Design a protein around this ligand. Structure first.
Ligand SMILES: [Cl-]
Ligand SMILES: [Cl-]
Ligand SMILES: [Cl-]
Ligand SMILES: [Cl-]
Lengths: 162, 166, 163, 162
């Protein structure tokens, strides 16, 4: 019904995300994360805070966010370029099954969904992801959620980057 | 005894298993040859589950920009890199690797243009303290075109709350 | 001589005086780049329209090449043949083709600091001008890095000046 | 014609070679000396043997050989890196004419030609060089002699180096 009431599953251990690398976003809300590959990175050896990092790669450009665990099964992201914070949740995760990995994550503007990222490495075959997206679309501002992998740029010999 | 004097004669150690690189992530490039790779962080990525060739990827990240290369093993302990943007191929080698020691990880890699060095990337996650890395740089600098090799992490852009990205 | 910009700037000798000095070695340099290095001057190619001369800095199998032309204030403007990058060089002093051979010290500045320093000779470092020049340059900002360039160089294989 | 029977003109005085500096190789046998500039250097002041040196410069790589005169109008080259010796001869020299300088030099493996180097500073217009090259190409192994200056790297503002 509203963004603040969506499911908030536990954040999997970082190792489960690393084992899923790289993932593609099948469904997103803004057009920022169209044609985008996600790679998770462990903290640098010398990092005192030991925050992990989410990489959102679109061609030759990249958006980076450190993240740490927060209350209520949240991930708090710190944009590495702007220092902007955002509180994210997982609607569900299904990492490293015999059919690969998927998850849907979101961040809210009160009752509205501000951003939505559904990732997978199996070309969108997980039944959980289909049901998750249909739920999110009925939340306020979820009408903007759209399939993200149409009319993306041509590749030049790499599978997941371009 | 005597240092190799052309790029084609530099050492070529075995390419470590990808897992050793992933456990090193992320690394910084302390010394590079062209300015393209100044202020840069390396992240290695396993092949996509659905990739047929199962090529791993090297990410070279400089602020909001990235350079990506798929790679596979080749002859003579080479890694054959495929630039994901252009399709250009390059044969790389490791001068040495020293991954996942009790003092962290370093390596130096290179690619040649015949007897000259064309690019050089020395990475570490220990702020440059591995003695292997110091000696390797001294060696590489002395091959044709190696005088361009330089310390790459001076005067880099300020951060906004992340340790290894900006 | 307190700062790089105020170092002496003697006239660039005619090219033939440099050619008669060939080859030279660098006794003292600032960066690591020109350790264990031999310098050879070359006239312009017959067909070169600009008739720039060329400085060759040779270290084993590696060569660094710079065309050069005269500039203002007794400068030599070097054009790196691989990149097209320009650098303004001066001579702190020259003493070419004496009865005890040839020496000079040359430098390039980054404002008040010295960016690179090259003292060349063919007499194994015995010109008294060179000792004094080095002492002066060493006190300019960044000149603390100036060091003797010919320790522990590679072994030769039958040639005197190249390896 | 076999290599051992090619002409052997007198080695010109060093100063004639210095006056021709720099030269480029128009024709060579192995690919080592493609896209290459030759510079001759007098002996170092302190060199007891007083051997001159030939510099073969291909972009950022230099090959060095000291040389001294030998029997039969030979020049004996000493590779400064490996210590390997090789007996060279001049097929002809034509240094410092009003149309510039050319020469063709060679070294043999008995009856076969092991290496060939035709230098000039006039873009290949000396008639002596044309005839010399024709002769050498008919010697055993001389079929590998080729034009050396096609598709060479682009320059960055220097005429004879790159
Ligand atoms: Cl996400
Ligand atoms: Cl690398
Ligand atoms: Cl100099
Ligand atoms: Cl020759």
């Amino acid at each position: 019904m509203t963004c603040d009431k969506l499911p908030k599953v536990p954040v999997p251990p970082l190792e489960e995300f690393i084992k899923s690398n790289p993932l593609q976003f099948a469904y997103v809300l803004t057009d920022t994360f169209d044609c985008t590959t996600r790679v998770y990175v462990q903290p640098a050896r010398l990092s005192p805070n030991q925050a992990a990092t989410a990489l959102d790669i679109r061609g030759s450009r990249i958006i980076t966010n450190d993240f740490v665990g927060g209350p209520n099964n949240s991930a708090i992201l710190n944009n590495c370029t702007t220092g902007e914070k955002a509180t994210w949740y997982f609607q569900y995760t299904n990492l490293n099954t015999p059919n690969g990995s998927s998850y849907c994550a979101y961040t809210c503007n009160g009752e509205e969904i501000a951003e939505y990222k559904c990732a997978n490495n199996n070309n969108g075959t997980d039944p959980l992801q289909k049901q998750a997206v249909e739920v999110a679309k009925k939340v306020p501002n979820g009408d903007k959620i759209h399939y993200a992998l149409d009319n993306c740029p041509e590749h030049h010999g790499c599978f997941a980057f371009y």
